[PDB]
């Protein structure tokens, strides 16, 4: 019989352009059949009624019932491409940074401010005009303040008096803007945050996309920390700049992929002071608008499936050579 690869995510993701491009290419594998789980089934049907698969590609986004995905995998024991339990941890920036540290991955110096919503003023925070003290640890402005929830994209940067003070408030892109300046110089007074040192870059962030530990595509975009106007080309797509990862960065990608057990994994790099710092790990994420990535990603994922399962299905398989870039 055919090896069945099941795709389990919100419809917004399962029906996206990159997903469709990749799934058509995986379907080209002679012994692989692709089954996309309907969102109505995922949300409304008990896991006992979900389609069967031999390999599961499943990932959380807003609205996704991760508890059900975990129960399904426990019930059916498929080969899992992106580990489901780690997807709880990826939602919490504190857990992300903790894992990166444990792996010896360079990251910004940071401190966690845990605030009790009932006792908001009892937290370990002291504010000056040009610095904060978080659990005793000092951060001179400029510094970055991130919500502990990785799904909350309201990241603020606080400027020193020497630069005019105030703050840059970042957010999920709304049309032509990714951030705005505010005259507010004082930090947020409700919620829990990670405070971290601001790393000076050349004005771009590097986005890295892994497909297994030995392949990573990188590209750069204008930092939303700069002025907040999104750069678009003549076709209306956000401008991306070419990146080739160095040997240190290729190792970072290998480590992130393995540490979080996410075969397909997106993360952000800051090129600063002659090193590269990870500032965010997003989990399952495809490159957009690259034909070559569609080809490479589908080939790599199909090969992973065949490598793992071809012996069980008595299918002959000799492992092929793959690009790393």
Instruction: Out of 83, 268, 295, 322, name the contact with Mg ion by CB under 5 A.
Output: 268
Residues touching ligand ANP: how many (CB under 6 A)? 20
Give the binding range for ligand ANP (CB under 6 A) out of 114-122, 248-256, 277-285, 297-305.
Answer: 277-285
Q: Please list every residue in the chain followed by a chain break, i.e. its C lies more than 2.5 Å from the next written N.
A: none
Instruction: Out of 1, 30, 62, 121, name the contact with ligand 0EJ by CB under 6 A.
Output: 62
- 133 annotated ligand-binding residue: no
Query: Nearest-5° angle of CA 80, CA 105, CA 256?
Result: 15
Burial category of 58 from C-beta neighbours within 10 Å (exposed 0-12, middle 13-18, buried 19 and up): buried
Indicate the angle between helix axes 291-309 and 17-26, nearest 10 degrees.
50
- 290 annotated ligand-binding residue: no
Task: Give the span between the Cα atoms of 213 and 102, in whole angstroms.
Answer: 18
Task: Give the span between the Cα atoms of 133 and 138, in whole angstroms.
Answer: 5
- 250 annotated ligand-binding residue: no
CB of residue 163 to ligand 0EJ, shortest distance in Å: 27
Instruction: Out of 282, 295, 308, 310, name the contact with Mg ion by CB under 5 A.
Output: 282
Query: Please, which of residues 253-272 interact with ligand 0EJ by CB under 6 A?
Result: 266
Query: Nearest-5° angle of CA 319, CA 320, CA 321?
Result: 135
CB 153: neighbour CB atoms within 10 A? 15
Give the binding range for ligand 0EJ (CB under 6 A) out of 142-150, 161-169, 195-203, 283-291.
Answer: 283-291
Q: Is there a contact between 82 and 58 (Cβ–Cβ < 8 Å)?
A: yes
Residue 223 contact partner, candidates ligand ANP, ligand 0EJ, Mg ion, none, CB within 5 to 8 A by sort of partner: ligand ANP
Burial category of 160 from C-beta neighbours within 10 Å (exposed 0-12, middle 13-18, buried 19 and up): middle
- 64 annotated ligand-binding residue: no
Give the binding range for Mg ion (CB under 5 A) out of 3-11, 38-46, 231-239, 268-276.
Answer: 268-276
Instruction: Out of 149, 154, 185, 282, name the contact with ligand 0EJ by CB under 6 A.
Output: 282
* 279 near ligand ANP (CB under 6 A): yes
Task: Give the span between the Cα atoms of 92 and 112, in whole angstroms.
Answer: 12
CA dihedral 304, 306, 311, 317 (to 10 degrees): -110
User: Which residues, in sequence order, are CB contacts of 49 under 8 Å at separation 6+?
Assistant: 41
Query: Please, which of residues 237-256 interact with ligand 0EJ by CB under 6 A?
Result: 238
CB of residue 17 to ligand 0EJ, shortest distance in Å: 9
Instruction: Out of 81, 144, 208, 218, name the contact with ligand ANP by CB under 6 A.
Output: 144
Give the binding range for ligand 0EJ (CB under 6 A) out of 27-35, 66-74, 280-288, 316-324.
Answer: 280-288
Pairing assessment for the beta strands 32-36 and 3-8 based on DSSP bridges: parallel
Q: For residue 187, which of 129, 138, 114 has the smallest C-alpha distance?
A: 129
Residue 288 contact partner, candidates ligand 0EJ, Mg ion, ligand ANP, none, CB within 5 to 8 A by sort of partner: ligand 0EJ
Instruction: Indicate the annotated binding residues for substrate.
Output: 12-13, 172-173, 207, 221, 285-288
Instruction: Indicate the annotated binding residues for ATP.
Output: 93, 146, 153, 172, 196-199, 205-207, 223, 268, 280-282
Instruction: Indicate the annotated binding residues.
Output: 12-13, 93, 146, 153, 172-173, 196-199, 205-207, 221, 223, 268, 280-282, 285-288
Site residues for ligand ANP per CB under 6 A: 108, 144, 146, 150, 153, 155, 170, 196-199, 205, 223-225, 268, 270, 279-280, 282
């Amino acid at each position: 019989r055919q090896i069945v690869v099941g795709i389990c995510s919100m419809a917004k993701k399962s029906k996206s352009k990159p997903m469709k491009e990749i799934l058509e290419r995986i379907s080209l594998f002679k012994y692989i059949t692709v089954v996309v789980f309907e969102e109505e089934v995922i949300l409304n049907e008990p896991v006992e009624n979900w389609p069967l698969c031999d390999c599961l590609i499943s990932f959380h986004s807003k609205g996704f019932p991760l508890d059900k995905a975990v129960a399904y995998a426990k019930l059916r024991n498929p080969f899992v491409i992106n580990d489901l339990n780690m997807q709880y941890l990826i939602q919490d920036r504190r857990e992300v940074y903790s894992i990166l540290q444990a792996e010896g991955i360079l990251l910004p110096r940071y401190a966690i401010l845990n605030r009790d919503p009932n006792n908001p003023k009892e937290c370990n925070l002291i504010e000056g005009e040009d610095h904060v003290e978080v659990n005793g640890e000092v951060f001179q402005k400029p510094f970055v303040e991130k919500p502990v929830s990785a799904e909350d994209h309201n990241v603020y940067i606080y400027y020193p008096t020497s630069a005019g003070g105030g703050s840059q408030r970042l957010f999920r892109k709304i049309g032509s803007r990714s951030s705005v300046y505010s005259p507010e110089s004082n930090v947020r007074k409700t919620g829990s945050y990670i405070y971290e040192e601001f790393m000076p870059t050349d004005g771009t962030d590097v986005k890295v996309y892994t497909v297994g530990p030995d392949y990573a595509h990188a590209e750069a975009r204008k930092s939303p920390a700069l002025d907040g106007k999104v750069e678009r080309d003549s076709e209306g797509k956000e401008v991306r700049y070419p990146v080739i990862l160095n040997a240190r960065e290729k190792l970072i990608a290998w480590k992130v992929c393995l540490a979080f057990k996410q075969t397909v994994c997106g993360f952000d790099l800051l090129r600063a002071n002659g090193q590269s710092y990870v500032c965010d790990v997003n989990g399952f994420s495809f490159v957009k608008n690259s034909m070559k990535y569609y080809d490479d990603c589908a080939k790599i994922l199909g090969n992973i499936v065949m490598r793992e399962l071809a012996p069980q299905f008595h299918i002959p398989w000799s492992i092929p050579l793959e690009a790393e870039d």
